Amino acid sequence: SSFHATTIFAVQHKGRSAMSGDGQVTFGQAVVMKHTARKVRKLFNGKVLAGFAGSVADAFTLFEKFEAKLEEYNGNLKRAAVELAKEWRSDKVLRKLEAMLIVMNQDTLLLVSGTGEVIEPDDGILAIGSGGNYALAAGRALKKHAGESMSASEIARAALETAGEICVYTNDQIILEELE
Amino acid sequence: SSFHATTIFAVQHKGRSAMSGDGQVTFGQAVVMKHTARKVRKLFNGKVLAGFAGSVADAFTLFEKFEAKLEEYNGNLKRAAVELAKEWRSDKVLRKLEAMLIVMNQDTLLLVSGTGEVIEPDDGILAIGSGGNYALAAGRALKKHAGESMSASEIARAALETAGEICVYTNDQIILEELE
Amino acid sequence: SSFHATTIFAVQHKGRSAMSGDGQVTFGQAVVMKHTARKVRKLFNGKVLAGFAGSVADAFTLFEKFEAKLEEYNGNLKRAAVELAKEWRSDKVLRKLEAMLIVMNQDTLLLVSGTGEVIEPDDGILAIGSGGNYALAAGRALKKHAGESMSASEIARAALETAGEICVYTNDQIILEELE
Amino acid sequence: SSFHATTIFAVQHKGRSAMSGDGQVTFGQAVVMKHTARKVRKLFNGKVLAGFAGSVADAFTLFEKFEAKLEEYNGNLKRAAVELAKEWRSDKVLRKLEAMLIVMNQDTLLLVSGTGEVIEPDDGILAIGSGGNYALAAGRALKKHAGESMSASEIARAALETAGEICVYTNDQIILEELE
Amino acid sequence: SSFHATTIFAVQHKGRSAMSGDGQVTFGQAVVMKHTARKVRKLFNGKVLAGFAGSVADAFTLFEKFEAKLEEYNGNLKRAAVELAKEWRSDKVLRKLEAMLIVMNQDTLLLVSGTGEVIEPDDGILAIGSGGNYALAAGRALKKHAGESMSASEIARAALETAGEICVYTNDQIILEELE
Amino acid sequence: SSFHATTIFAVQHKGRSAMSGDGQVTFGQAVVMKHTARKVRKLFNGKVLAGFAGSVADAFTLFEKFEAKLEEYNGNLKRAAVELAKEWRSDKVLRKLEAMLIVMNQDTLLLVSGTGEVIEPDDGILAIGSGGNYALAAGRALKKHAGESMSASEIARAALETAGEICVYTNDQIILEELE
Amino acid sequence: SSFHATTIFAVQHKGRSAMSGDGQVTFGQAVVMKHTARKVRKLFNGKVLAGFAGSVADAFTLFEKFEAKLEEYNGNLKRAAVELAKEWRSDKVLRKLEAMLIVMNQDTLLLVSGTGEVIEPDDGILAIGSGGNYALAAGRALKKHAGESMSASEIARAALETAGEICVYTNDQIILEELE
Amino acid sequence: SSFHATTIFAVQHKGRSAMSGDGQVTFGQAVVMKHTARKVRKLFNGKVLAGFAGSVADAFTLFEKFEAKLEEYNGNLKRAAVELAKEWRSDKVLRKLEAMLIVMNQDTLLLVSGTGEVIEPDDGILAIGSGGNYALAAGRALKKHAGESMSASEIARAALETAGEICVYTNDQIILEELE
Amino acid sequence: SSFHATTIFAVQHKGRSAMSGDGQVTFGQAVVMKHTARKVRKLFNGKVLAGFAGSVADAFTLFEKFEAKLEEYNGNLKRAAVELAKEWRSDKVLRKLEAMLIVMNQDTLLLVSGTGEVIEPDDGILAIGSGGNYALAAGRALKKHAGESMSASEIARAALETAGEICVYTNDQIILEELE
Amino acid sequence: SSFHATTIFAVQHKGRSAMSGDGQVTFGQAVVMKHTARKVRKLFNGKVLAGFAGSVADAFTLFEKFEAKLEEYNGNLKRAAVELAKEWRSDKVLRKLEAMLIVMNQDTLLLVSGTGEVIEPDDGILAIGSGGNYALAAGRALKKHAGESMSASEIARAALETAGEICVYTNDQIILEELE
Amino acid sequence: SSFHATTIFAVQHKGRSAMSGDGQVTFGQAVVMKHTARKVRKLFNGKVLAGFAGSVADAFTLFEKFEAKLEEYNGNLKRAAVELAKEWRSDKVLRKLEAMLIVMNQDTLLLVSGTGEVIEPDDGILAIGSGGNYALAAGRALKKHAGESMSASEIARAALETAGEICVYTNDQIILEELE
């Protein structure tokens, strides 16, 4: 069989911008090889958060094509988001690729898919990978519910946390990133 | 094809005991026939909450065998929980049956399965049916997070709410039940 | 292969109560054997409308069990609806059976299923068999939009009409029934 | 799994020409990621309406090839329709592509398919994406029945409306477009 | 593998009543064991034609249950048709049974199915077994077309004839039956 | 799913040469998008009838390669028939292509297949697409049977007619073509 | 579905060398389109017999490559046999191809396969296509038993004959060929 | 989907006899409902250890039949082991059942299976449920290597420990049992 | 069928660095062809250990690309690890390839996958091929428990040992390697 | 998954009568639970050898029904062989049963199958279970080849031996039985 | 379907070097086309035995690439073995290829696989194709057992012999080769 997605969660609340992801590398059906991996990077002079879901070749790889194209247009996510899609959708080797890409900036927030989708969350919460939905369900849940009572940073941390709790493919060691 | 599960969520917080479920009846792949159904009943002189997931024949049906056996032992869920399992696990017609049964009392809380399982949630949250997990992920999420800030009743309401929001098979019209 | 469901449509608007169904008997993949069949009967001194979907054995058969139990409780659809569910859900031969049952009265309106479901449409339109949805779509659509502009009888007629238009399994010759 | 088609509906009644589509982005089995998206664009100095179904790469992408070839022949839809078919049908990457294209003009109206089909509705209603039929059913149904009673704009709106009602893959927020 | 259906064709034109069937026994995928078999019998003092499709146990077997029930009601096909369905639909061993039963009388004409269907051809042509459709397509074809120019008897003969000509599972040696 | 074949029927009787086809565009399982389409063209100074089955890109497309190669040999169907096969059989994009091509001339008559077959009907009747066989069964049926009593033109018309009558994927609006 | 192989049979007895094949063109599951086709040709100044099985493109096509390489080595079947194998086995389009090739000369006798096999029958009977074995069975059987009693020509004829008898895919009209 | 086995491990080293099992109740694909469950019981005046794997109905249920037959023969595991096999293997409801049974005594040690197997480990380690092997691997491994260095109790504990490490279906909270 | 992975195990304890793998070559379902093979090589002036899993072509092959890129950056595993990933992940022929690569150095330790993953075990044990987990289970288990009590070399040896015990795909003859 | 067959080999040479079988209990795909099991018993005052293949419930179970019926006829294997078949073939629970039964006497030798076969080896060698064929291939091999050079007893021993050597599901610890 | 492997057996005993293979060409499921074929060749001035398994195109083909590369290194099997693997593993057309290659020399002995394996039998016996295992089981069997009592040459002969005896896809006519 294959390696399982990592779970990754981005959220944007009261103008803080945040991305949490697990470390759990779940190989095969059931086996776990590692308990920690970095797939949330900081891109472009800490201006963007991007987490990928996938293999660190694929991972690294996409990332730069997002860079390249971010410079290639001086800060416009949406634009570069797109022009990557095009690039990803077309490339033989990545077009087939399963996972997605979470990109966000100071302002705004994007799902970006092997398949050439690019998605914009109405409510400032995006989420990918194994437990995705579970954390999505945590995210949206908290924001709606203890927006005032908690933070950006915090809400995301927690997303993941809940995930690992319902979710076999998600684990307690969380990486956390925010912009300034 | 078949009718989809309803989603139902029970939770027990700061000694309030609560069960929310959607109404959405999703027939076939995609079609929706109704937007309201009662599958959360009050059982045994408002002493127990029980929601089922399923068909109201099956529904009604199980319910009474839980009654019958609740009287048959003067208030002991666990006991009756079990002795139903036995009964359900064995019966030709219900043993095959898909969904589960959420039963709770003043005190405590149980999953009860066609298959003769009976389950006890460490953290006082149980959840069944379509969006289950999504609401489970809301439940556990809130409790952990705005326990103080919100209620029994409330937390459950909301579970469902979030569900319908991620979940195609779950819908906004929620039934709510609590004991005293 | 098997014979295809017939399409049947019931609706209830400004106090008239109505059931339209096609005649198309579509055998096998593609073949059509007949262009007319009656599966909408009048039941219980023209007090109820019921159409079934299925085989006229199964058809006849269910119908009487719904009779028997309608008398068995002096006009209560819902009640008898149910008690049929029970009976159908249990029976070896009818439990497995595919199609559902539309039953409505002066007052009110029910889906009733081999599976032990019994369903109540918030908005007075019910629909079964091949083109079903197509006509549910038409139903639903007419009422919201030309409630004023058209009738019970007429709205039902049309549903089917539109069905046979999109749907290869539904055909122009429609049986129409109403109560008084 | 994959993202679900969006539902799009075009219709043409008493000389107004109209395109409605939902916003529901339904990822995976059941999950919903967004509630709004634009895939109905205005093309060629607001002379044509076109909605696509698909991914905004694929979306964008097709659209321009339909531009390019619309100019390439000074207003002839049908012509360009075709010549696109050809181009789409051949291209490695778009040929396999799932969804279709609705293109209409002042005058007339076209389905255009990855497969090299190009389709002309006898009755001025075309329809794509998830709930499609549901809304085609509504479309078709409205026009036959409340042609008089309602408009272009309005009939299209409603289609979608009814869709989101039966259909779990279609949602209430509708984008509406007409030409002059 | 299994033995293939025989093809059988009944038709009723200008008040002559006629049933043709092939002899071809096609075993396994491709093999042919026999070239002649009688599955068209005369029943009830040459009052009825009945052909079955199937095994001559099953064959013989059904036949008598049609007899029995024909006497059991003094000439009413429809009635007995039905009451067989019931009987066939229910019996463990015949309910599963694939093929159908063509029954006709002086007057009228019926398909009768393992599944408890009973069918009435609007246009006085019925047809079962391998080439069914091909002969159905001959039948309906001729009647519509050289009604005047040909007979009952004749039209049926020919049905089969055409069948064997398009159809691998149908063969030239035809049995022919009519009533007086 | 996919668009269904159109049905098309060519026949050659008492030296008249004729091609009928339906209009029915059956999309998806059951849905119908259009009720009229031209896929029977006149080719080569009304010297040849050719109907295709398929997409009008594919359609148009094949057609010209038949033209081109018909000129390329001054009237010899068979020859050009073949040399197309070669061309079609080899081309990546059409070799996979499902449907076939009916070509006929003043004299004679050919099936021509994506797969590089080229076929010659002993009896001057060819037929493709959805109801094919049903009309084939009508064709061969009539000719054999009311050759004298009817025409080229006529026999073909009717083919289709019968088809739509047994066949869900075939519809009453027929296009008719003949040479002089 | 696809067209069915034609059955072809070659045999070599008391120094006569013989190839019989049917004419039955069996399209789709069950349908028959033609009753005659030539796929047994005479090659190389009536020095070789070869029948193919397949499509007359593929047919023609292979044949010439066997020509070309027969000249390419001045009468050596086996040699050219092979060198064809090579060529066929490699070619993208013919490698995948289903059927095989029977080639025989004055002297000797070969099976030659899309797969790069080349086969030599110990006992001078080779056989391909639908009924093949059936006729190989007949072949083989005749020679062992009425070698004396019958001929080359005759034994081959008969094979096919017997084929069309057991086999639905094989038919009575046989093409016969021998060398001098 | 279904609930996942719990992992249970028994081992027997330097005359102590030991059973460890996790608490993880893993429902569905990925979900976890509980983190604690007891399926290791003490049987027969703390004379036997037995853990089951399964549902606490099935669980309870088997257990007693092993009681009953343990008394039924005054301490002989193997005997009763068997006679249970027999009983389990035969019973309609338990025969199909998935999981196995670990039974051990002062002396000795048994696998016992729904299938009528009864197994004796040469080396005193037995193991069932989700992570099983993982822990059998750990078991086996510890004993061979740190027999001296560690205990009964301890070796068993650890097995599970290591399980929950590799295995997503196994979790940290371990129930531990030994006899005297 | 195919040849089975060989089992390979690397571990790193108290600064010794170790790789054990079996010799069992298990062809087909059940068959064993050889009992010894070398797929653990010493790389880069005995500075690295690497074992592959696979075919000695694939084996050899990968190995050198890991050489080449190890030189290509003067001792940095991780770096070269990656740059290999890239290369492997991309290459048509190696990308599809099943097995992974274990690479470790004086210092540190890597999984490297045809898929473009590159993995770092928190606890210094890595493991591939047939029995893998079994030995990972043993690995992991030994270190936690008899770290003190045993060595690098020894712990690795044993892993495999235990493997061949549970695992039919792993066998007693172990190749052992360490660096200095 | 399931437990794998044991391998068992019976052979009869120069009037010695012998049965060898492995011990290897291979659970699941790959896992091995035990290395020794007795499934070769001596029956009927050491007059018969019988090995079964299967579960020791099933095992024991069959055995006695062979006993019972052996007494029930005073020494006639064949007879009792048969009358067991009947018994086994019919019984609901054993008729489904996979493995077979090797029975032999002073004289002669029998395969006896769940399915109601009873088989007699021409050459005095029978063999069942995992490696069957491999040992069968050893058996027949030796006898043919070093009949003189080796024994009954010996040849069988060895069978198994070879098996475990090619065969993953067969292991070195062999049980051996002979009569006098 | 396809042609079945030939069986081929190489063995090396007391310094004689030997390769036996059957002739049986088993086509399709069950059919046999030929009873003799040479796929064991002598290569390189009778210095090497090589048998292939497969098609004589593929066959011949591989063979020379083994030659070429054998010269290309002056007698080193292993080396050339390998460098073929590389070549075979990579080539589009042979990499997919099923069977293997048995190569041996004066000294030593190799399996060589489409997949880029190259294998070395510990015990000087290799075997490929249909009955492989059966003869493998004979080979290993005899050597172990009547090494002294029989020869190289002999042992191999016999392998095959036994095969054809258990094995449907292996036949009595054996080709035998040895070096000097």
UniProtKB/Swiss-Prot annotation, chains A, B, C, D, E, F, G, H, I, J, K:
InterPro entries: ATP-dep_Prtase_HsIV_su, Ntn_hydrolases_N, Proteasome_sua/b, Proteasome_suB-type. One of its GO terms (molecular function) is metal ion binding. It is an enzyme of class 3 (hydrolase). One of its GO terms (biological process) is proteolysis involved in protein catabolic process. The keyword Protease applies. Belongs to the peptidase T1B family. HslV subfamily. PANTHER family: ATP-DEPENDENT PROTEASE SUBUNIT HSLV, METALLOPROTEASE TLDD. This is ATP-dependent protease subunit ClpQ. The lineage of its organism: Bacteria, Bacillati, Bacillota, Bacilli, Bacillales. The gene is clpQ.
